[PDB]
RNA sequence: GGGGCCUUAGCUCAGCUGGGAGAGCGCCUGCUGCAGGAGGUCAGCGGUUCGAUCCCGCUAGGCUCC
RNA sequence: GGGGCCUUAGCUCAGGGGAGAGCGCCUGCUCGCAGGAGGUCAGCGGUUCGAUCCCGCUAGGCUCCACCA
């Protein structure tokens, strides 16, 4: 994991630099596992994101806008009761574990000064945000409850004593000498990267591989020097925030990862890196989890129809072959003088077959139309926003951008928005865009003659909100709205179009974010 | 006795009142919590029909009901 | 079964004159500010110049009774 003890150390330093002494002005919880503190510090308003998400747990200052629920969750209201209005006195790391502790001076209901500790544990699935009394060391509440049945060592419930996770009894990299490295590392046993992780606290396999790489030939002379150099870089805050992309897979770190043969992009801090790294990924997995019941249903219903098609086909084939039964009783009728119920039984098998052809063919066609419908829904679910999931659910039961030139671009992200955009909002000569033979979002430029740059920007947006968002070249069709038509009885969003031109674009998240009107 | 309702995968139940057998939990696999697996004569039996938990015929059994 | 009481905005409650106030939630402003959000006044049909506040009924929720052989 890229968010390791060393990364936590660097983040803790950055947070102290940015928000120590800062007043918590507002607390929000936009998502189930994500809390946002609005902090007034050093003449600036900072947004601190605290994520206890199983896959995307992180702490950083974020520029991103987040939509808050109409009703704040109970944990948010609890945090507001205890620590909103308070001052962050200190931020510290628990050893070199992935646990940040925010010391927050607040006032009680009577007005007396109280100190609260906010523990932010970054442990993947077990990641948590826990508020305690500093005097009594008693848990006020945690974002995730841990019952004694789930963990015998530590309980995370209101009114219980806060206990850290079990210590790993590992050496501190920030205090380690050359002799400490030489005593603990068996240079003959191999897997030196693993040995480093086993002996040194806070060190990931990513860091350990970098250390082994920088050593060149990892031996008793080279590896201790490489480790101490890397530890010194961390201890002295000589951070180079970077993301390295190797074969489509991104790695982020607080130091340069020379062991990775890929394109390295540097940053002024780590927030932007994490925003980019987890952009789409956190949402897609959450959507996948919420959609899993529908997908399993939709995929089943699609599969059902294909199977239905196959059987009907066999009844059509039976119908064709049945002609034999017509022969059988014709011949039996001709030769009666030389059994008749057997003739008639064959004939009847024929007629039943023959009559099944037209019904089978019709039922194959209808099952094919259902497969196409379900294939469209599967794609829509893959690129949907949270609102789009609601609109698709309603169907199953039954955004503004500005170009570089200053032209308004409108986007529908679901079937209902797509229908509303194309049929009610868009003017007759406005330019409509959509991905060719790839399900996606309807995009409309509010201009009859947009410049080529605006077309490419709008196409990039269309491709970004399509199934092909991860492809290097995506075909996007565009035409005037007057050429786009909803067929009679078609579901919302579904349209036929003519007189189209196709452009090819690479989807880019940064371009889409830059063009988004606030 | 008279009426009433259900029997479905390892387990428990969905499924519109034919549109093509599912979920949750447990279990098996790998990953680092995730997906993906298995698994049903839909109690059984036989009509209907292009497909039947689905419609009806036809018997189990258990509950509801005096 | 009968009596007795209840049903107002997210929440808590004001209130025959055309449905408010605080808090929450939104507006910009940083312990106060500054404007919004939101009502079939349980419902019904009627008294009338107007009904949340008449009056008669229907819901529902509580409450008290339903005994004597």
XYZ file of C-alpha atoms (C1' of nucleotides) in Angstrom:
653
model
C 0.000 0.000 0.000
C 1.292 3.450 -1.027
C -0.137 5.164 2.094
C 2.417 3.628 4.506
C 4.019 4.825 7.786
C 6.617 6.934 5.924
C 3.828 8.509 3.811
C 1.813 9.112 7.026
C 4.892 10.822 8.553
C 5.232 13.166 5.536
C 1.471 13.872 5.530
C 1.549 14.627 9.299
C 4.377 17.142 8.665
C 2.429 18.809 5.803
C -0.751 19.015 7.947
C 1.103 20.619 10.901
C 2.566 23.164 8.427
C -0.884 23.956 6.948
C -3.531 23.645 9.711
C -1.874 23.533 13.202
C -3.423 26.245 15.404
C -6.374 26.315 12.951
C -10.046 26.658 13.980
C -12.502 23.968 12.805
C -15.256 26.189 11.332
C -17.520 23.489 9.794
C -17.692 19.668 9.766
C -19.359 17.724 6.924
C -19.796 14.033 6.058
C -20.620 13.884 2.296
C -20.245 10.063 2.161
C -20.566 7.095 4.562
C -16.773 6.838 5.149
C -15.619 10.419 4.306
C -15.521 13.361 6.772
C -14.487 16.912 5.768
C -13.264 19.609 8.190
C -13.351 23.243 7.044
C -10.365 24.736 8.910
C -9.446 28.436 9.190
C -5.623 28.471 9.513
C -2.852 30.987 8.647
C -5.256 33.376 6.856
C -6.668 30.619 4.563
C -9.703 28.293 4.471
C -8.525 24.663 4.105
C -10.670 21.544 3.550
C -9.234 18.499 5.374
C -10.551 15.167 4.013
C -10.598 12.217 6.441
C -11.399 8.979 4.550
C -11.986 5.676 6.380
C -12.960 4.013 3.053
C -11.965 0.286 2.800
C -10.105 0.802 -0.515
C -9.472 4.605 -0.594
C -8.590 5.476 3.039
C -6.460 8.646 3.198
C -5.975 12.004 4.938
C -5.092 15.187 3.007
C -6.084 18.806 2.318
C -8.474 18.724 -0.686
C -9.481 21.367 -3.260
C -12.340 19.128 -4.504
C -15.977 20.204 -4.100
C -18.166 17.628 -2.293
C -21.977 17.387 -2.221
C -23.300 17.112 1.359
C -26.477 15.135 2.229
C -29.621 17.130 3.093
C -29.551 15.497 6.564
C -26.109 15.161 8.264
C -25.256 11.626 9.545
C -25.171 10.885 13.293
C -21.352 10.678 13.472
C -21.075 14.097 11.735
C -23.527 15.634 14.243
C -21.556 14.040 17.122
C -18.271 15.520 15.803
C -20.042 18.899 15.418
C -21.288 18.710 19.043
C -17.793 17.984 20.466
C -15.168 19.625 18.184
C -16.813 22.135 15.748
C -15.578 25.623 16.731
C -12.472 24.061 18.378
C -8.754 24.557 17.623
C -6.267 21.938 16.352
C -3.439 22.179 18.920
C -1.263 19.384 17.468
C -1.243 16.616 14.847
C 0.976 13.599 15.649
C 1.589 10.076 14.311
C 1.349 7.040 16.625
C 4.952 5.839 16.222
C 5.330 4.993 12.519
C 1.917 3.256 12.318
C -0.685 4.640 9.873
C -2.541 6.432 12.704
C -2.817 10.236 12.911
C -3.925 11.807 16.224
C -5.486 15.300 16.090
C -5.421 17.056 19.479
C -8.442 19.412 19.397
C -9.040 22.018 22.129
C -12.792 22.723 22.416
C -15.345 23.901 25.018
C -17.977 21.790 26.827
C -21.658 22.841 27.208
C -20.811 24.823 30.407
C -17.935 26.668 28.633
C -14.959 24.900 30.307
C -11.976 23.996 28.107
C -11.826 20.318 27.024
C -9.298 18.484 24.823
C -10.513 15.789 22.402
C -8.308 13.328 20.483
C -9.395 12.391 16.936
C -7.686 9.143 15.853
C -7.602 8.555 12.069
C -6.555 4.932 11.407
C -5.564 4.036 7.811
C -5.838 0.220 7.764
C -7.760 -0.522 4.528
C -10.971 -2.389 5.480
C -10.378 -1.641 9.198
C -9.772 2.130 8.621
C -11.600 4.269 11.207
C -12.140 7.787 12.579
C -12.476 7.716 16.394
C -13.126 10.635 18.808
C -12.058 10.289 22.469
C -11.853 12.306 25.666
C -8.166 13.208 26.194
C -8.350 13.165 30.032
C -10.211 9.853 30.536
C -8.980 8.166 27.281
C -12.634 7.086 26.777
C -14.174 6.714 23.295
C -16.973 9.228 22.675
C -17.749 7.525 19.330
C -16.140 5.929 16.249
C -17.253 6.135 12.589
C -17.071 2.307 12.551
C -18.030 0.260 15.630
C -15.856 -2.757 16.532
C -17.672 -5.188 18.862
C -15.764 -7.613 21.178
C -17.001 -10.481 18.940
C -15.145 -8.924 15.939
C -11.916 -8.101 17.860
C -11.004 -9.660 21.249
C -7.975 -7.342 21.733
C -9.711 -3.933 21.300
C -13.346 -2.726 21.311
C -14.374 0.490 19.511
C -17.682 1.568 21.090
C -18.931 4.662 23.010
C -17.914 4.637 26.700
C -15.015 2.150 26.192
C -11.291 2.832 26.736
C -9.423 3.660 23.501
C -6.739 1.037 22.770
C -4.204 1.300 19.933
C -3.767 -1.739 17.625
C -1.167 -4.322 18.796
C 2.438 -3.091 18.563
C 4.618 -4.762 15.894
C 7.856 -4.544 18.009
C 9.754 -3.152 14.982
C 12.720 -0.757 14.755
C 12.112 2.920 13.915
C 13.633 3.944 10.525
C 14.061 7.511 11.859
C 16.346 6.229 14.692
C 17.991 3.269 12.869
C 21.801 3.003 12.616
C 23.941 1.064 10.098
C 24.620 -1.482 12.888
C 20.857 -1.973 13.508
C 20.419 -2.774 9.778
C 23.393 -5.206 9.774
C 22.149 -7.067 12.907
C 18.570 -7.606 11.651
C 19.092 -8.269 7.881
C 20.218 -11.772 6.805
C 21.992 -11.044 3.490
C 22.307 -14.811 2.686
C 18.561 -15.654 3.044
C 17.426 -13.429 0.120
C 14.181 -11.414 -0.228
C 15.863 -8.375 1.375
C 12.807 -6.211 0.517
C 10.642 -8.519 2.693
C 13.238 -8.550 5.526
C 13.214 -4.710 5.579
C 9.387 -4.694 5.915
C 9.543 -7.348 8.690
C 12.108 -5.446 10.851
C 11.379 -1.712 10.210
C 8.174 0.032 11.362
C 6.155 2.045 8.818
C 8.116 0.614 5.833
C 6.033 -0.777 2.937
C 7.115 -3.283 0.236
C 7.118 -0.283 -2.156
C 9.713 1.600 -0.050
C 11.746 -1.580 0.609
C 11.939 -2.381 -3.139
C 13.149 1.203 -3.775
C 15.857 0.756 -1.088
C 16.986 -2.584 -2.603
C 16.978 -0.950 -6.088
C 19.009 2.123 -4.991
C 21.558 -0.285 -3.410
C 22.210 -1.779 -6.889
C 23.890 -5.000 -5.737
C 22.146 -5.343 -2.351
C 24.914 -6.444 0.063
C 26.248 -5.640 3.583
C 27.875 -2.379 2.291
C 25.407 -0.992 -0.300
C 21.966 -1.725 1.238
C 22.533 -0.092 4.697
C 23.796 3.080 2.935
C 20.771 3.099 0.564
C 18.355 2.556 3.497
C 19.973 5.278 5.672
C 19.912 7.718 2.708
C 16.177 7.039 2.173
C 15.469 7.287 5.941
C 17.385 10.609 6.039
C 15.312 11.897 3.071
C 12.124 11.135 5.083
C 13.483 12.425 8.438
C 14.713 15.722 6.887
C 11.396 16.203 4.959
C 13.150 16.118 1.543
C 9.894 14.992 -0.094
C 9.374 14.690 -3.859
C 5.602 14.000 -4.198
C 5.222 11.958 -7.408
C 3.001 9.470 -9.256
C 4.713 6.854 -11.478
C 2.572 5.114 -14.148
C 3.788 1.629 -15.202
C 1.740 -0.255 -17.863
C -1.478 1.637 -16.989
C -1.004 1.081 -13.202
C -0.302 4.173 -11.071
C 1.888 4.264 -7.951
C 2.065 7.330 -5.669
C 4.790 8.086 -3.091
C 6.436 10.900 -1.074
C 9.872 10.000 -2.586
C 10.995 9.246 -6.165
C 10.523 5.538 -7.031
C 13.525 4.838 -9.297
C 12.743 1.064 -9.283
C 9.574 1.736 -11.367
C 10.233 1.994 -15.137
C 7.381 4.400 -15.949
C 6.328 8.030 -16.492
C 6.855 10.004 -13.252
C 4.750 13.148 -12.644
C 5.779 15.431 -9.736
C 3.535 17.614 -7.516
C 3.873 20.440 -4.948
C 1.998 18.301 -2.349
C 0.263 14.850 -1.993
C -3.464 15.824 -2.031
C -3.598 16.300 -5.831
C -1.814 12.943 -6.314
C -4.401 11.126 -4.137
C -7.335 12.978 -5.756
C -6.053 11.820 -9.175
C -5.074 8.272 -8.079
C -8.470 7.555 -6.419
C -10.551 9.611 -8.935
C -13.198 7.329 -10.471
C -11.815 4.256 -8.617
C -13.522 4.958 -5.251
C -16.813 5.845 -6.987
C -16.736 2.932 -9.491
C -16.285 0.335 -6.704
C -19.043 1.953 -4.585
C -21.343 2.059 -7.651
C -20.408 -1.594 -8.395
C -21.374 -2.569 -4.805
C -24.727 -0.703 -4.972
C -25.373 -1.981 -8.537
C -24.362 -5.619 -7.783
C -27.973 -6.741 -7.117
C -29.219 -5.003 -10.309
C -26.248 -6.217 -12.414
C -26.780 -9.812 -11.202
C -30.504 -9.400 -11.995
C -29.930 -7.600 -15.335
C -27.214 -10.090 -16.424
C -29.501 -13.007 -15.425
C -32.500 -11.538 -17.330
C -30.293 -10.942 -20.394
C -28.913 -14.514 -20.097
C -32.487 -15.820 -19.673
C -33.523 -14.246 -22.999
C -30.576 -15.766 -24.924
C -31.514 -19.205 -23.518
C -35.172 -18.520 -24.440
C -33.976 -17.662 -27.978
C -32.022 -20.954 -28.277
C -35.005 -23.142 -27.265
C -37.572 -21.387 -29.498
C -35.061 -21.896 -32.362
C -35.192 -25.676 -31.695
C -39.040 -25.473 -31.861
C -38.735 -23.632 -35.222
C -36.354 -26.392 -36.421
C -38.826 -29.038 -35.146
C -41.517 -27.183 -37.175
C -39.515 -27.395 -40.414
C -38.693 -31.125 -39.943
C -42.332 -31.800 -39.040
C -43.229 -31.919 -42.799
C -42.467 -35.661 -42.392
C -45.606 -35.977 -40.226
C -47.666 -34.435 -43.099
C -46.169 -37.114 -45.382
C -46.738 -39.872 -42.796
C -50.530 -39.543 -42.553
C -50.884 -38.735 -46.284
C -49.216 -42.093 -47.032
C -51.223 -43.833 -44.262
C -54.438 -42.297 -45.705
C -53.537 -43.533 -49.220
C -52.702 -47.069 -47.959
C -55.506 -47.593 -45.365
C -56.804 -50.713 -47.192
C -53.517 -52.584 -46.538
C -51.981 -47.779 -37.361
C -54.244 -44.809 -38.249
C -53.929 -43.398 -34.691
C -50.126 -43.719 -35.082
C -50.330 -41.830 -38.431
C -52.383 -39.091 -36.749
C -49.956 -38.948 -33.775
C -47.035 -38.288 -36.163
C -49.079 -35.695 -38.167
C -50.012 -34.043 -34.827
C -46.328 -33.877 -33.794
C -45.757 -32.151 -37.163
C -48.560 -29.614 -36.878
C -47.437 -28.762 -33.309
C -43.880 -28.324 -34.565
C -44.891 -26.351 -37.724
C -47.179 -23.997 -35.732
C -44.354 -23.302 -33.216
C -42.011 -21.761 -35.878
C -43.702 -18.311 -36.075
C -44.169 -18.075 -32.273
C -40.527 -19.119 -31.712
C -39.186 -16.551 -34.222
C -41.282 -13.767 -32.627
C -40.077 -14.796 -29.141
C -36.432 -14.874 -30.343
C -36.853 -11.302 -31.692
C -38.407 -10.040 -28.420
C -35.683 -11.791 -26.362
C -33.009 -10.155 -28.585
C -34.554 -6.681 -28.029
C -34.471 -7.441 -24.263
C -30.774 -8.453 -24.487
C -29.989 -5.145 -26.282
C -31.940 -3.202 -23.612
C -30.056 -5.008 -20.797
C -26.689 -4.543 -22.590
C -27.412 -0.773 -22.711
C -28.323 -0.745 -18.980
C -25.125 -2.683 -18.091
C -23.064 -0.011 -19.891
C -25.054 2.890 -18.344
C -24.474 1.407 -14.851
C -20.693 1.243 -15.586
C -20.437 5.055 -16.189
C -23.350 6.212 -13.970
C -23.335 8.906 -11.280
C -25.311 8.377 -8.001
C -28.290 10.278 -9.493
C -28.115 8.135 -12.662
C -28.460 4.987 -10.511
C -31.740 6.411 -9.116
C -33.097 7.236 -12.610
C -32.164 3.748 -13.920
C -33.877 2.205 -10.843
C -37.058 4.229 -11.555
C -36.966 3.042 -15.202
C -36.593 -0.613 -14.055
C -39.603 -0.168 -11.716
C -41.681 1.569 -14.438
C -23.925 19.339 -15.391
C -22.729 22.647 -16.909
C -19.275 23.140 -18.460
C -17.657 26.151 -20.143
C -15.325 25.705 -23.141
C -11.986 27.573 -23.382
C -13.782 29.888 -25.878
C -16.552 30.582 -23.288
C -19.306 28.450 -24.906
C -21.745 26.660 -22.563
C -21.635 22.837 -22.670
C -24.473 20.820 -21.052
C -24.209 17.129 -20.046
C -26.884 14.542 -19.233
C -25.383 11.669 -17.188
C -28.493 9.388 -17.112
C -31.385 8.432 -19.436
C -33.801 10.994 -17.884
C -31.223 13.824 -18.107
C -30.309 12.713 -21.675
C -33.999 12.851 -22.694
C -34.505 16.205 -20.903
C -31.358 17.679 -22.525
C -32.132 16.504 -26.091
C -35.937 17.083 -26.139
C -36.598 20.093 -23.808
C -33.392 22.120 -23.122
C -31.356 21.968 -26.364
C -32.165 24.397 -29.204
C -32.840 23.064 -32.721
C -29.426 24.098 -34.151
C -27.329 23.330 -31.004
C -24.589 20.714 -31.549
C -25.289 17.329 -29.901
C -22.464 14.818 -29.215
C -22.347 11.144 -28.143
C -19.882 8.215 -28.318
C -20.365 6.107 -31.479
C -21.772 2.594 -30.760
C -20.632 3.030 -27.119
C -23.201 3.879 -24.420
C -22.471 7.156 -22.645
C -23.644 10.691 -21.820
C -25.449 13.114 -24.153
C -23.401 16.328 -24.509
C -24.780 19.549 -26.059
C -22.828 22.686 -27.018
C -25.070 25.782 -26.726
C -23.919 27.078 -30.142
C -24.924 26.529 -33.789
C -21.319 27.005 -35.022
C -18.822 26.001 -32.274
C -15.069 26.243 -32.918
C -13.038 23.034 -33.450
C -11.473 23.341 -29.956
C -14.957 23.459 -28.328
C -16.014 20.381 -30.368
C -12.891 18.495 -29.165
C -13.467 19.640 -25.541
C -17.158 18.600 -25.654
C -16.139 15.286 -27.296
C -13.545 14.725 -24.518
C -16.379 15.251 -21.980
C -18.656 12.813 -23.896
C -15.857 10.198 -24.042
C -15.014 10.763 -20.334
C -18.649 9.948 -19.368
C -18.772 6.848 -21.641
C -17.906 3.138 -21.292
C -14.688 3.915 -23.262
C -13.347 6.437 -20.662
C -10.129 4.360 -20.221
C -9.431 4.051 -24.007
C -6.678 5.976 -25.842
C -8.923 6.861 -28.839
C -12.738 7.114 -28.595
C -15.031 7.845 -31.604
C -17.514 10.655 -30.801
C -20.338 11.464 -33.243
C -21.753 15.010 -33.407
C -24.713 16.534 -35.299
C -27.325 19.312 -34.903
C -30.163 18.524 -32.441
C -32.722 18.663 -35.322
C -31.120 15.446 -36.723
C -31.503 13.649 -33.326
C -34.886 11.922 -32.816
C -36.436 9.710 -30.117
C -38.185 6.670 -31.704
C -41.841 6.079 -30.760
C -42.060 3.845 -27.661
C -38.268 4.005 -27.051
C -37.042 4.228 -23.442
C -35.703 7.576 -22.078
C -32.317 8.661 -23.491
C -32.500 6.354 -26.554
C -32.201 8.310 -29.827
C -31.513 7.794 -33.537
C -29.489 10.407 -35.452
C -28.277 11.201 -38.990
C -25.922 13.653 -40.777
C -23.218 13.064 -38.136
C -19.473 13.747 -38.191
C -17.051 11.671 -36.061
C -14.061 12.971 -34.064
C -11.492 10.884 -32.127
C -10.493 11.959 -28.581
C -8.501 10.687 -25.589
C -10.541 11.090 -22.349
C -8.768 13.294 -19.773
C -9.997 13.813 -16.189
C -7.953 17.025 -15.705
C -9.471 18.695 -18.809
C -13.015 17.734 -17.671
C -12.362 19.158 -14.155
C -10.905 22.409 -15.597
C -13.944 23.023 -17.872
C -16.491 22.302 -15.079
C -18.506 25.404 -14.099
C -18.621 25.741 -10.289
C -64.978 -31.666 10.333
C -65.185 -26.811 7.880
C -62.783 -23.254 5.626
C -57.086 -20.383 4.732
C -51.935 -20.243 3.154
C -47.257 -22.121 1.846
C -43.626 -25.859 0.450
C -37.933 -23.293 -4.034
C -29.870 -23.882 -3.897
C -25.863 -25.753 2.113
C -29.600 -22.729 5.004
C -33.683 -19.047 4.820
C -36.950 -16.847 1.332
C -37.673 -13.775 -3.414
C -39.737 -14.087 -8.196
C -46.776 -10.259 -10.325
C -50.389 -12.811 -10.050
C -46.077 -17.263 -18.458
C -41.854 -13.500 -20.260
C -37.386 -17.766 -19.112
C -35.173 -19.506 -11.198
C -32.724 -15.288 -7.945
C -31.078 -12.767 -3.309
C -29.049 -12.940 1.946
C -26.398 -15.907 5.027
C -23.031 -20.208 5.096
C -19.541 -22.905 2.146
C -15.255 -23.410 -2.021
C -11.203 -20.248 -4.832
C -7.579 -16.467 -5.392
C -6.360 -11.874 -4.161
C -5.854 -7.824 0.351
C -11.579 -6.934 2.538
C -12.754 -8.080 -2.630
C -14.979 -10.325 -6.607
C -15.664 -15.209 -8.614
C -17.469 -19.976 -7.694
C -20.671 -24.011 -6.642
C -26.085 -25.344 -5.752
C -32.939 -26.470 -7.261
C -37.536 -32.570 -10.229
C -39.068 -24.468 -7.748
C -42.671 -30.614 -1.979
C -44.065 -34.365 -5.467
C -47.119 -35.968 -9.721
C -49.361 -34.634 -14.741
C -52.265 -30.578 -18.021
C -52.025 -26.162 -20.438
C -49.429 -23.987 -23.882
C -43.932 -20.480 -27.402
C -41.593 -20.369 -22.330
C -44.883 -22.603 -16.302
C -42.305 -21.288 -8.951
C -45.624 -18.761 -12.409
C -51.670 -21.541 -15.347
C -54.711 -25.308 -13.973
C -55.177 -30.545 -12.918
C -53.401 -34.133 -8.838
C -51.597 -35.961 -4.052
C -48.335 -35.084 0.076
C -46.891 -32.365 4.465
C -46.742 -28.115 7.963
C -49.038 -23.995 9.728
C -54.035 -20.484 9.904
C -58.752 -21.149 11.358
C -63.450 -22.326 14.579
C -67.800 -2.721 22.942
C -68.564 2.104 25.408
C -66.483 6.461 27.026
C -62.231 10.247 27.506
C -58.208 12.617 24.858
C -55.090 13.592 20.746
C -53.664 14.534 15.550
C -49.933 22.250 12.700
C -43.654 23.171 8.719
C -37.549 18.740 9.122
C -37.982 19.128 14.711
C -40.465 21.608 18.964
C -44.749 24.492 19.614
C -47.630 29.347 18.842
C -52.243 30.632 16.606
C -63.268 32.887 12.696
C -59.473 37.384 10.098
C -56.674 34.363 5.778
C -50.998 29.295 8.894
C -46.331 31.841 12.698
C -41.834 31.525 15.998
C -37.138 28.928 17.518
C -33.962 25.233 16.242
C -32.280 22.139 12.017
C -31.723 22.657 6.839
C -30.186 26.434 2.620
C -28.167 32.383 1.555
C -23.117 35.317 2.638
C -21.041 36.618 7.281
C -17.316 35.132 10.868
C -21.397 33.641 18.443
C -23.851 36.521 17.004
C -25.437 38.031 12.159
C -28.666 37.784 6.999
C -32.650 36.155 3.984
C -34.744 31.657 2.381
C -36.673 25.723 3.083
C -41.166 23.687 4.514
C -48.043 23.293 5.894
C -53.932 18.447 2.100
C -53.620 22.633 9.795
C -55.268 13.647 10.459
C -59.301 13.365 7.010
C -64.587 14.190 5.567
C -68.828 17.727 4.890
C -70.994 22.064 7.000
C -71.909 26.613 10.128
C -71.082 30.966 7.916
C -68.611 37.016 5.806
C -63.873 34.055 6.102
C -62.747 27.966 9.661
C -56.399 25.372 12.432
C -59.069 27.181 15.718
C -67.255 26.297 14.613
C -70.172 21.706 14.575
C -71.278 16.643 13.012
C -68.947 12.296 11.423
C -64.600 9.076 9.724
C -59.768 7.540 10.640
C -55.622 6.327 13.680
C -52.761 6.690 18.610
C -53.116 6.586 23.636
C -56.299 6.411 28.275
C -60.222 4.468 31.363
C -64.050 0.945 31.708
C -66.436 -3.875 29.674
C -69.062 -5.922 35.928
C -73.524 -9.473 38.877
C -75.137 -14.133 38.389
